[PDB]
């Protein structure tokens, strides 16, 4: 079973009839461990004309958020320390220009407090959570690595414009190299989890009857069978 | 000459069209009265420098010797112009009354850009008579003169009550045409009138179709 | 060029006019800091680009086998082992001239005529 | 006018909607507060020669040469239009087609650097120079049209014809030089609403 | 130089083990697939 | 004849190299209504096409009135010039969506080529005849062209029928 | 190279069903660290402290879609790991791509 690989930088132009100009995406999943299937969407409204914001989509967030806040929300509030990460050439006025209107957007939030706030003390605390378990979940969910991702989020918005400025073509959607193939071994995983997780909460039910062996090891036998027999993976 | 020499030249083709339309409808006009060259037109409704006074363009016309034979009660027509690129409820009464007394039956105001919603809400306020509104930029070229546009013709309630009888048709069973159709307007059709179409046919030579105006 | 921002509250620099003295000043709208203008140029648009054709050419651009070999001769060391290509500006309106670079100088001489 | 080669063009360039955006190679906004000298060398003269028989904001434009040679235009013309577009609230100056550097200076007449940026687009995307709108590319063609010679017999009498790459009718009908008795847009959708259900069918 | 019968032939870093290895089971059994209209193969 | 053809492809190759040189110098004009790139295309296509077109025609008049394949073309019972051509002379240039083989690999047709190679052996021109047995590259391109055919042939087959059903109903 | 061009079902899904070539193979899963180490022990100044202007042509390296810092002159660092693999101490299955043009 073929499937567009994950953890890679792409960029797509989106048709004249649409409030969005171009967009870049990146599918992320832990190479070893659960394998979450939540993708990061860093859109770019305002077509290649109209008077051009930059918003990105996060898991559980209703609307989309403007990149600026995301920097201050990480731990970098001042400029030039930000372009440090984005641009690797102070003499690239073109790129820089585009960004101007955007800084003004977030100009209304001048610190980390409100930054982690606007995402609707309880939420701010929750905000952190959404950065260690939702924000770019691959790479690692440890703690003291905040810095690196900032350089990433800079390298992305970069790769973006590099196309949005007709310097690099739109990413070849069917460039097989950026496609993987889940053979037998891999399949028995994403399938298993769905099961074992129902097995997890099954042994939870027996303990929720014990007003004080039992495990019918056929559900892991018959479950597997169902799929392989018919062709219906998911439980 | 500047670029105002042309702002007359266009208003003129738009003019000439009206004429043609007035004559095709079934009215009086001398071939000369239609062939009033752009030259002898300029010097007639212009002041000094080069601005046009429409208040002096309006006129009357009447039913030819023939038209009374097929269409009995076909009244007299009246075309009026205005220099106000946005005419309103006031210069309206100038029209609304002007006909309500003279007693014509056919009003044809030529709004340059547009009449007011407060204004036009007084058109069916002078019945039996009816009034139509035509934008300027839509009358510079007569659409009937076109190659694909075939010559049409109206039909008396006799020739109509015949057609229907001759083919045993129930009106609804007849090909339609929109009331706000460019040609339908041009000939001032009405909900209930028929129109005979005569066009070329690469199989027999000439076919005769008819469209009623719903 | 390499223009600048400003210390204290590290932000973008917006310009303002030095009224009483008639000259251009630059500033900040977060604190108060103000430094004069580095250059009178503020914004440029360019609807018919030409910048980015020379696209990053590290000396190592001679070990990438997927590139063509031309036997011309640079405007300086006068060698005869040069590589080339066309503008990297993916613009449907660009042109198709060849720019050549020599591994023993780094010029940008064309083949045009 | 049938085989009048230049007459074809003479109308072509009078219908094909050309906008400032397709001739501007670049645009910049410098700061020059002195309406009696420039901070530019190759500009000096053009100031001094403007002292014989307002706002501090300057605006310079770098137009493309070959694009001004293609569709053919003149600074005198170009500006003339601009001026009557805005009128009494925008002073503009300009070099002359002869020079080795085309330039266009200008000034106007609570945060101005934001407004004079909104007026950057409205100038580059809401200002047409020549043409009825929506009609880009316009090629020319010589078609084969058989026809009745005066001597009776039918014969080869080819005539030039203009084909477009866009669709506007209401306007391109009343254009000096066409036969608004033969005009035709392939957009049947339009035609029926404009020329009457009949002509639609024909199409 | 060459024979006017055979097929006309038109820094190197790597070589192809053999072009006839890009095929899978199906085409692998077809003799001279380079002489038929490809869509037929 | 197999020789007489060869130098009509060699010369045509140079008649291409000439206009590629004359293009990598901006010494060519944009055919009105088309982009310099599009206008680049416009010539290569009309060059390779006209080459193959006469390439075959050379053999056509070289095949006597007894040649069976010919007979089956005169009779009108199968195939036409084109067919013979692609089997005895030059198959031709391959193409998809109207334009010569794209650049799926960054700035090149295949990795076996030097980047920015605009020549015909890269843009999909099969110079060989079926009788001579195509080269790998050529063999590949050819398929991608045919591949396009089968696509709609498994879509227009019933979509025309869709379009049809409406017309009926 | 990877897939056979001809073998594929007619009609319906056609080209959505591909068969593998003879020489093609799929990866299995090697280890990152024995090369991460091998990097941060040969010239690899960690990403953490970077200066875009001070470090102009710093060749950045990505690992499985992650940015594990940059590196100065890579040319030697490169043709050593690849030679280490050829002897077989870091699985022949890993992929290493250098995009000089960037
Ligand atoms: Zn500050
Ligand atoms: Zn050199």
UniProtKB/TrEMBL annotation, chain A:
It comes from the Eukaryota. Residues 6-182 form the RNA polymerase Rpb2 domain. It is found in: Nucleus. Coiled coil: none annotated. Belongs to the RNA polymerase beta chain family. DNA-dependent RNA polymerase catalyzes the transcription of DNA into RNA using the four ribonucleoside triphosphates as substrates. Component of the RNA polymerase II (Pol II) complex consisting of 12 subunits. This is DNA-directed RNA polymerase subunit beta.
From TrEMBL, chain B:
Coiled coil: none annotated. PROSITE patterns: RNA_POL_H_23KD (PS01110). Residues 141-213 form the RNA polymerase subunit H/Rpb5 C-terminal domain. Its main location: nucleus. It comes from the Eukaryota. Keywords: Nucleus, Transcription. InterPro entries: Arch_Rpo5/euc_Rpb5, RNA_pol_Rpb5_N, RNA_pol_Rpb5_N_sf, RNA_pol_subH/Rpb5_C, RNA_pol_subH/Rpb5_CS, RPB5-like_sf. GO terms for biological process: termination of RNA polymerase I transcription; termination of RNA polymerase III transcription; transcription elongation by RNA polymerase I; transcription elongation by RNA polymerase II; transcription initiation at RNA polymerase I promoter; transcription initiation at RNA polymerase II promoter; transcription initiation at RNA polymerase III promoter; tRNA transcription by RNA polymerase III. Transmembrane segments: none annotated. One of its GO terms (cellular component) is RNA polymerase II, core complex. It is found in: Nucleus. Residues 7-98 form the RNA polymerase Rpb5 N-terminal domain. GO terms for molecular function: DNA binding; DNA-directed RNA polymerase activity; RNA-directed RNA polymerase activity. Belongs to the archaeal Rpo5/eukaryotic RPB5 RNA polymerase subunit family. HAMAP family: RNApol_Rpo5_RPB5 (MF_00025). This is DNA-directed RNA polymerases I, II, and III subunit RPABC1. It comes from Komagataella phaffii (strain GS115 / ATCC 20864).
From TrEMBL, chain C:
Zn(2+) 3 binds at residues 6, 31. Zn(2+) 6 binds at residue 28. Zn(2+) 4 binds at residue 8. GO terms for molecular function: DNA-directed RNA polymerase activity; nucleic acid binding; zinc ion binding. It is found in: Nucleus, Nucleolus. Zn(2+) 13 binds at residue 104. Zn(2+) 8 binds at residues 74, 77. Zn(2+) 1 binds at residues 6-7, 9, 28, 31. Zn(2+) 9 binds at residues 74, 77, 102, 105. Zn(2+) 10 binds at residues 74, 102. Disulfide bonds join 74-77. Zn(2+) 5 binds at residues 8, 31. InterPro entries: DNA-dir_RNA_pol-M_15_CS (IPR019761), Rpa12/Rpb9/Rpc10/TFS (IPR012164), Zn_ribbon_RPB9 (IPR001529), Zn_ribbon_RPB9_C (IPR034012), Znf_TFIIS (IPR001222). Zn(2+) 2 binds at residues 6, 9, 28, 31, 74, 77, 102, 105. DNA-dependent RNA polymerase catalyzes the transcription of DNA into RNA using the four ribonucleoside triphosphates as substrates. Component of the RNA polymerase II (Pol II) complex consisting of 12 subunits. This is DNA-directed RNA polymerase subunit. It comes from Komagataella phaffii (strain ATCC 76273 / CBS 7435 / CECT 11047 / NRRL Y-11430 / Wegner 21-1) (Yeast).
From TrEMBL, chain F:
This is DNA-directed RNA polymerase subunit. The chain holds residues 676 to 844 of 1743 of the full protein. Belongs to the RNA polymerase beta' chain family. DNA-dependent RNA polymerase catalyzes the transcription of DNA into RNA using the four ribonucleoside triphosphates as substrates. The lineage of its organism: Eukaryota, Fungi, Dikarya, Ascomycota, Saccharomycotina. It is found in: Nucleus.
């Amino acid at each position: 079973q073929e499937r567009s690989a994950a953890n890679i930088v792409q960029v797509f132009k989106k048709a004249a009839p649409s409030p969005i100009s171009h967009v870049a995406e990146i599918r992320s999943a832990l190479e070893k461990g659960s394998r979450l299937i939540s993708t990061m969407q860093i859109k770019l409204y305002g077509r290649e004309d109209k008077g051009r914001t930059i918003k990105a989509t996060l898991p559980y967030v209703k609307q989309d958020i403007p990149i600026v806040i995301v920097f201050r929300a990480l731990g970098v509030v001042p400029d030039g320390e930000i372009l440090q990460h984005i641009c690797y050439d102070e003499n690239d006025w073109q790129m820089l220009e585009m960004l101007k209107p955007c800084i003004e957007e977030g100009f209304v939030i001048q610190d980390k407090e409100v930054a982690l706030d606007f995402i609707g003390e309880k939420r701010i605390q929750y905000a952190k959570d959404i950065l260690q378990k939702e924000l770019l979940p691959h790479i690692t969910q440890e703690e003291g690595f905040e810095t690196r991702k900032t350089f990433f989020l800079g390298y992305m918005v970069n790769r973006l414009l590099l196309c949005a400025l007709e310097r690099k073509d739109q990413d070849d959607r069917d460039h097989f190299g950026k496609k993987r193939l889940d053979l037998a071994g891999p399949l028995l995983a994403n399938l298993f989890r769905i099961l074992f997780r129902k097995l997890t909460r099954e042994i939870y039910r027996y303990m929720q009857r014990c007003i004080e062996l039992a495990v019918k090891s056929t559900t892991i036998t018959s479950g597997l069978k169902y799929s392989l027999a018919t062709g219906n993976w998911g439980e | 000459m500047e670029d105002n020499n042309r702002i007359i030249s266009r208003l003129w083709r738009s003019f000439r069209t009206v004429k043609e339309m007035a004559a095709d409808r079934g009215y009086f006009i001398s071939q000369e009265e239609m062939d009033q060259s752009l030259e002898e037109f300029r010097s007639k409704i212009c002041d000094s420098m080069g601005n046009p006074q429409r208040k002096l363009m309006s006129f009357l016309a009447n039913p030819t010797p023939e038209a009374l034979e097929k269409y009995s009660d076909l009244g007299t027509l009246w075309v009026e112009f205005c220099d106000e690129p946005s005419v309103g409820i006031k210069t309206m009464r100038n029209f609304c009354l002007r006909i309500q007394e003279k007693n014509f039956s056919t009003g044809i105001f030529i709004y340059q850009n547009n009449i007011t919603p407060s204004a036009n809400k007084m058109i069916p306020t002078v019945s039996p008579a009816i009034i139509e509104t035509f934008q300027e930029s839509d009358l510079v070229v007569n659409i009937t003169h076109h190659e694909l546009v075939p010559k049409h013709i109206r039909l008396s309630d006799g020739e109509k009550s015949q057609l229907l009888q001759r083919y045993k048709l129930k009106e609804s069973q007849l090909p339609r045409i929109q009331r706000e159709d460019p040609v339908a307007r041009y000939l001032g059709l009405k909900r209930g009138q028929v129109v005979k179409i005569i066009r070329r046919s690469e199989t027999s030579g000439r076919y005769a179709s008819y469209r009623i105006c719903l | 060029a390499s223009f600048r921002f400003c210390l204290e509250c590290n932000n973008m620099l917006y310009p303002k006019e030095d009224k009483e003295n008639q000259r251009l000043l630059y500033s900040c709208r977060n604190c108060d800091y103000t430094e004069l203008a580095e250059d009178p140029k503020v914004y440029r648009h360019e609807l018919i680009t030409n910048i980015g054709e020379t696209a990053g050419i590290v000396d190592d651009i001679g070990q990438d086998p997927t590139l063509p070999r031309s036997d011309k001769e640079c405007p300086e060391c006068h060698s005869r082992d040069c590589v080339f290509f066309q503008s990297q500006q993916r613009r449907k309106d660009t042109n198709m001239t060849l720019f050549y670079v020599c591994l023993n100088c780094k010029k940008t001489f064309r083949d045009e005529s | 006018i049938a085989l009048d080669i230049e007459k074809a063009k003479v109308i072509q360039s009078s219908i094909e909607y050309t906008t400032l955006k397709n001739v501007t190679s670049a645009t910049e906004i410098y700061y020059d507060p002195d309406p009696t000298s420039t901070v530019i060398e190759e500009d000096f003269d053009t100031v001094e020669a403007y002292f014989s028989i307002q706002s501090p904001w300057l605006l310079r434009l770098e137009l493309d040469r070959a694009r001004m040679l293609d569709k053919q235009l003149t600074m005198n013309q170009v500006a003339d239009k601009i001026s009557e577009v805005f009128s009494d609230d925008l002073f503009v100056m300009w070099s002359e087609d002869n020079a080795d550097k085309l330039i266009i200076r200008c000034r106007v007449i609570a945060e101005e650097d934001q407004m004079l940026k909104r007026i950057e687009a409205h100038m580059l995307d809401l200002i047409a120079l020549r043409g009825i709108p929506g009609i880009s590319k316009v090629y020319m063609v010589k078609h084969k049209v058989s026809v009745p010679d005066e001597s009776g017999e039918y014969k080869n009498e080819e005539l030039w014809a203009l084909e477009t790459d866009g669709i506007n009718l209401a306007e391109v009908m009343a254009v000096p030089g066409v036969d608004s008795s033969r005009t035709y847009s392939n957009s049947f959708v339009e035609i029926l609403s404009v020329l009457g259900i009949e002509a639609t069918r024909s199409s | 130089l060459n024979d006017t019968a055979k097929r006309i032939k038109p820094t190197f870093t790597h070589c192809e083990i053999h072009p006839s290895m890009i095929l899978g089971v199906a085409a692998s059994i077809i003799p001279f697939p380079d002489h038929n209209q490809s869509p037929r193969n | 004849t197999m020789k007489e053809i060869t130098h009509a492809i060699s010369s045509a190759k140079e008649q291409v190299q000439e206009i590629i040189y004359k293009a990598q110098h901006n010494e060519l004009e944009l055919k009105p209504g088309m982009t310099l790139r599009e206008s680049f295309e416009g010539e290569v296509s009309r060059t390779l096409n006209d080459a193959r077109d006469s390439a075959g025609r050379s053999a056509e008049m070289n095949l006597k009135d007894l040649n069976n394949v010919k007979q089956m073309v005169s009779a009108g019972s199968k195939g036409s010039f084109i067919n013979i051509a692609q089997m005895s002379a030059c198959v031709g240039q391959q193409m998809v969506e109207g334009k010569r083989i794209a650049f799926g690999f960054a700035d090149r047709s295949l990795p076996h080529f030097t980047k920015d190679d605009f020549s015909p052996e890269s843009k999909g021109f099969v110079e060989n005849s079926y009788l001579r047995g195509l080269t790998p590259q050529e063999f590949f391109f050819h398929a991608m062209a045919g591949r396009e055919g089968l696509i709609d042939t498994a879509v227009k087959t019933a979509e025309t029928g869709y379009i049809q059903r409406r017309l009926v109903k | 190279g990877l897939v056979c061009p001809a073998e594929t079902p007619e009609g319906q899904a056609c080209g959505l069903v591909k068969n593998l070539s003879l020489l093609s193979g799929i990866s299995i899963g090697s280890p990152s660290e024995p090369i991460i180490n091998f990097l941060e022990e040969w010239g690899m100044e960690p990403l953490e402290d970077y200066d875009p202007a001070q470090h102009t042509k710093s060749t950045r390296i990505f690992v499985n879609g992650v940015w594990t810092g940059i590196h100065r002159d890579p040319s030697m660092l490169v043709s050593t790991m690849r030679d280490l693999r050829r002897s077989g101490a870091i699985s022949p299955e890993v992929s290493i791509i250098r995009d000089i043009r960037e």
